[PDB]
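Changelog entry

Holo records now carry the ligand SMILES as an explicit input line rather than a separate metadata file. Below, a converted record for zinc ion, shown in the new format.
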Amino acid sequence: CYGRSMATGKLVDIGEAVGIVAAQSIGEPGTQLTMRTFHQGGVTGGADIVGGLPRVQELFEARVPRNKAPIADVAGRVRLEESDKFFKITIVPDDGGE
Amino acid sequence: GVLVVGPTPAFLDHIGRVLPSLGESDAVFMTPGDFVPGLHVTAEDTPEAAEVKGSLKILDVLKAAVADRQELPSEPIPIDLSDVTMRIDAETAKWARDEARKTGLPHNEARAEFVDVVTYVVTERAVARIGRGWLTRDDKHAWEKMRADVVGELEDHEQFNAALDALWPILTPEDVLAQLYTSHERLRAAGAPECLWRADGEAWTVSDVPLLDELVDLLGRNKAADEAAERERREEEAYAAGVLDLMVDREDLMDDEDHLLAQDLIDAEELADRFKEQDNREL
Amino acid sequence: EVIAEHPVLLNRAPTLHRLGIQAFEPQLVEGKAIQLHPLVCEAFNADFDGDQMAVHLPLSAEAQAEARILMLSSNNILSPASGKPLAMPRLDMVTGLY
Amino acid sequence: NSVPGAPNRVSFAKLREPLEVPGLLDVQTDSFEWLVGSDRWRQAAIDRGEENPVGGLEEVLAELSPIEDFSGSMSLSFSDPRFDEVKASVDECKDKDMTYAAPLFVTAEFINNNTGEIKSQTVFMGDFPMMTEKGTFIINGTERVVVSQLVRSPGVYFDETIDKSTEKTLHSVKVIPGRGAWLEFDVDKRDTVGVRIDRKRRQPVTVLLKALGWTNEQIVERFGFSEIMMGTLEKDTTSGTDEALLDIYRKLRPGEPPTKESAQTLLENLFFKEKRYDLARVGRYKVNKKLGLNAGKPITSSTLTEEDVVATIEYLVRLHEGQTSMTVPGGVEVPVEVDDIDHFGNRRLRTVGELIQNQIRVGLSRMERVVRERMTTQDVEAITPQTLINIRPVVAAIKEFFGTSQLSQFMDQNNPLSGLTHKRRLSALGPGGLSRERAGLEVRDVHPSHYGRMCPIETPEGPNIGLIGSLSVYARVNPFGFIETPYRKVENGVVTDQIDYLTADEEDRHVVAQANSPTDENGRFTEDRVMVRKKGGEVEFVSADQVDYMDVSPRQMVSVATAMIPFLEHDDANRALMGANMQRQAVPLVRSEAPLVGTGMELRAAIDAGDVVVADKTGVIEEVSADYITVMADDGTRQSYRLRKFARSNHGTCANQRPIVDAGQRVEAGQVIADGPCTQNGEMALGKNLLVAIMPWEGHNYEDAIILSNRLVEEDVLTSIHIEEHEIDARDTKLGAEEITRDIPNVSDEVLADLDERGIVRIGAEVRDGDILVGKVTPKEVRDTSLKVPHGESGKVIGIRVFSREDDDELPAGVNELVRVYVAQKRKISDGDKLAGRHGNKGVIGKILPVEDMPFLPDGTPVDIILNTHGVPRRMNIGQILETHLGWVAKAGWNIDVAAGVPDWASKLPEELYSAPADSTVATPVFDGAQEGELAGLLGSTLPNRDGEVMVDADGKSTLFDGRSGEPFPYPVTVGYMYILKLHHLVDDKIHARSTGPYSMITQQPLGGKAQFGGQRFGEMECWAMQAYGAAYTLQELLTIKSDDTVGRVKVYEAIVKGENIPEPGIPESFKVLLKELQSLCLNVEVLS
Amino acid sequence: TGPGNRPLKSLSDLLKGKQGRFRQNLLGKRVDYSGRSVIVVGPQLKLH
Amino acid sequence: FFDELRIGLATADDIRNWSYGEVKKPETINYRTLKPEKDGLFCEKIFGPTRDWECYCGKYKRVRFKGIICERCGVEVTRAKVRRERMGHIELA
Amino acid sequence: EEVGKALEEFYPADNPIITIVKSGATGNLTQTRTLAGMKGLVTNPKGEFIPRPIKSSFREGLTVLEYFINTHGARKGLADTALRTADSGYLTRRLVD
Ligand SMILES: [Mg+2]
Ligand SMILES: [Zn+2]
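Structure line, unchanged by the conversion:
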């Protein structure tokens, strides 16, 4: 299920620590990534998009994204309405109802 | 920020068509009935009781309305312990209510002073058993059982603490009104007229919202709730301190020339303050 | 007669992955600097502007064999992160072959 | 030139210097002069300064005197400090481990108001250390430097900021004195103004206003334009002046019995009484010019007031409300704005004199408390100053500033420049500035107020980047401690020859131009859109009529170690930083050689450092030996200069001086008479010129490594002498006497052959690890604890320095003898040793080749150093290519053929630069030097070789031969001469190894370090890497048998020495104590199997 | 409360803190049979 | 070696087994003579010697012979810091 | 951008400074532009852009102001390169845990 080892090129062995390899492979290049500004104080720069190490810590902790978006609860079609600054969306199921 | 008050938000529909930077970020619409964060009781208008509860002669009531809750026992609620004798009386309760009023602090703020005064009162029976103490410790340490009964009664407390909650209850500002409108002597006891009477208190009108707000300035807060958040903050900071302990030390370097490390530009507190969820919302 | 067939581990900090520790066969040289093959220098992230390197020596047969087999540089030619080779021609070699 | 014996060094400079380089340790001598109130500073100040010039001692005493008592009856006063000649000299102080000090005396007058009697005496205040003409102090023998300090000037500073939670823009105010308590103000996240008297609980602001005697009518007339301040008033339960003073004495002195008079005497004797709160003249001036107060007035009254504590609030409130303009009721208009904190009009320099002033102040305060303790416990009219005064405290302060501080540092002498940049240094750390709470990332950066005041480049590479820096070359220090740099006054567009030493505050008010800006007729600019700076460093092009000032020279914003890097505008900044900080740590060589291509700032950096010797007086030379030199002046007075020969610097280097004069030589004044460790004819020579070929070789110059000839080892070119000092003390033990003898316990008499009568080693002998140096016997009867050579050390015994108690010279508590042995080692360049150039090009030495297999030229000349091509463009330091080219152009002379006019690439060249012979010396100043036109066609000229053959073409390239094969490399290679530096990073100092030895007996691992003879840290990341391989036995081995397991390492040593299988722990061993103590807790544990 | 003003020590308080075999070092061991030097290049060399 | 690790509550039986004596007296040491006490804290009569190889009595202080239970102190002369790897106990009323 | 374009065009293929790059041995064309073209824009200590660019190369030689304003972002890169290691270490310790 793991597969083969990238070092040997042959199918992986029994007893091979494959979690430490994962941690290292993901962390080592962590300096090639954007980050949160290093300044003592200021305004939250998250107003703009920041999608490097922040996004990764987010996902690996499974906390709620900032620029969240809702996902379809049920397949079907969509009915879209717009008030002033508010979007309303209604999904109508193709087979079921409600 | 900005605040807009009125029935129709159509006044806030101008700030948004000439200054969008606010009409969708900064401006805040409220109606006389939304002032509180958590309820929008607007349609619940009221007859001319408003005039009474909409004019500062009601402030008095509020204060007295708490005084009608700084209650004292009808008869000595007995100390339900074996090797002591009830000292709780309108005497001690009176002494301590006066002491608490005498520091000019809201109710939940002076709860602590009240309880400390009552502990030093019960110190009487803690050491005044007949003449004084009567144990083999009372020749050099007159207070072995003083501060073993009084510093243990905050642990043997359920009876003491619960029967204290009658004379100094931690009021969440919604109840002081619920059980001020239902009753009939509270209105007069605190100074209120009788029109203010009503059966269901939680059926809130437009004219009890500013009262509900002022209650939060009149009462206070717990001051001891955030006790586990300190634990979690400390443990996060410790994890960051360990992160920095992992890193290479200036004396164990295998490089050509010394250079800047992270241990001399950042500490655990700030390193941990940036991996936090640090949720942000608009004004 | 004793430095022969006895591997040694070379390490350079910070060690962000396992190729930052590698086993090598010692060749005894006159001098006081360590000669390092130029192809193991991208894993180590090493250069010769002054950088230092640490040497560890195993004693138990088990560790000698772990070095000879698992750690030897002539076996860790590839990354355990993408399968890419690391011990491959760098700058001088590259321009020569180009 | 302008120096008597100035060896000619032609210059490509196209601009003239209207201001010469000022003294380069006149920032460590002017301040000491000020302190001791010498007459030189006195004159200098009377010229441009008050007509009552007070020093630094005078001022301290005047603030101390008169020492009155509670009864106002008897008074003591000090005056007239006075220094008598030094007891010893610098050389004597070093030879004897003494201290360079002068006795200090003071006139103490003792008045009694009862009887009107006086008891003046000239009392003795102890020996005071002195600043040597080289800008140093001498302490127990060692040269030491008191490095200046950068600190926030006293005054008022307003800082906007953002609330971590509300993300709300708020404001603040902070008043900091030179001495006393702070006074802060805030506008809170809830629009309530408040105060933080002596950094205590934030009570409101009107409380203070009332405590000073203000009525709500006043609070509402002064204020009232605002509505947060009124709203703060309205919510002051503590209405009433005395209720407010009670509130304050409560917050400060909580609970303890109060009093109204105590209240006023606290609110007064904390801010307004000039003994518990003082704004030195600088704080007073800052406050005045900031708030709009006391314009053009006699600053004499240097303390706080009640009008400023109000104008401060008023400024703050018009700040929170966006008002840009203020006017105190009676003051002058003012700009309302925030105050930067890194700016240097707000940062100020505590020089050595100020530091010592402060510590003397401490000592004097203690002596004053003692005076009082001892004045009202002794019969009156019978007490005299000498009875009231105990100096023992003061000396301690002094003996505690040099002996043990952070700004008093062992002198950094790897070379003259290393010590000369240790004195023009600006440190942001030490008691008084940021210590640990503010080592962030916005103070470590460059600020446009650094131009001409602090070098943007020279800052060490270690942890103190942005904290420590070096002062520029044209910069001096105001008396208020603010740093000043000169500019030229423009009047209509025509550069005047008038100078103005401005500071950042003043500079920010005008448009400061650039030195390279053109001029045609006595100053006027040629262009129309000239380039300038502005307030916030905002470089801009502007009309030449908008201009008000101008920079005297380029190289204004650079330091010494950075104005000695040729072609600096061609090298990026990190590698220039490297170049400087490596030019500091360059080891002196036996015979020194100065650069062909260099900069004009190498003569002064050696004269103005002090390792050279210069003539005090004009005259001729009467005698010249290796050690002494003897001059007969014109006045007839005979001078005698003694020279340092093979003396040990504080870093192991050599300090040998050598004469460069012949008997019968009419020297002038300021003329160099001897050269130092790294000078030749009076200019810095830290390295050597080497024949370089820019090319890759057979892999031996890979990844910044580099190659050498064996010539540099035969001729002793990059050789250096290193000296080491070993000391041993024969101190008391209570079992007898630690005796130094030759009758050592039973040992090989063969070890006792290089030892003299007294068991000490014999000069001239050679040593090796373990060899005895001095036989010391501590009593038991007798043991052997002698001084033996350490690990990895050897050399010749130069000489010895013994210090006995039978002379009673001086020795610490419980000692009877000290022996210091010096040993010298000639170290040659070797595989591993680090090597570098002035451009950040560095590397180690991978291969040393015989000259018969070195790329040679058609004339037979083998190159001396091979450098690779691949490191030059990605590292952005091509200044070394230009240096190579010009080195060729200078070792081979040149003749520009002007027969048909001067070529167009030479229309900007200074005549006298149209020709030069071989081995010539030139100068390329950092930002006014050799260009590329002046250097392209100047490579063709290149006078031929002895055989008429031109060995290098107009592109910089030759045609080499493989000294191994024999064939010519098929493409031309870039050849020239490069100035190369040998560094303190040597491999005999880095090679460390261990098998067994001593442990820490606390953590019970081996020790950490090389002198400790320790091991190497196997950390956590390394354990991860050791797990990802799946290696369990190496990890076990490393964590048990090597560091902690104390019963296993022995089994292992024995196994190995016996040749049996190295054992294995049958069951883990760190587990047993925890097993016990969990069983002891009544928790059954069963190791299963 | 032991002599003075302190919490007297206890068996099961050893382990709630840093002291005890249970707390992880996050440090090294300064191992024996080890060394350090400066590395130069050798191109006449094999990978092993 | 081993593979597993199990814990559990301890009865009085397993403890009576673990310990080789009984603790009865309240004191750590004696200042005068700096010699350990007996039958109490710092057992010098059950676990073995004070430092090593000895007994509370010094009757036996040599290596040649080990295990001879001191006919005065009933002590087994041995070394290696046994009194660190040794747990006493009490039978509390 | 136009300068880097014109510069990788104008240069031949037998040039060493372009050869060492297009061979994958070292370097980028950004460095070759900085060296033979223009350094371009540089950073403040805030981390923002100075809209007055450096029109000079390290071949022409930089003026005094240009060199001074390059030092700003040249010092701001020695710390970043260290704090980034602590961030990486945080995440790596998490993942290894
Ligand atoms: Mg390096
Ligand atoms: Zn015995």
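Spot-checked after migration. The pocket of zinc ion (ligand 2) is lined by residues F 55-57, 59, 70, 72-73, 75 (CB under 6 Å). Chain B touches chain C through eight residues (CB under 8 Å).
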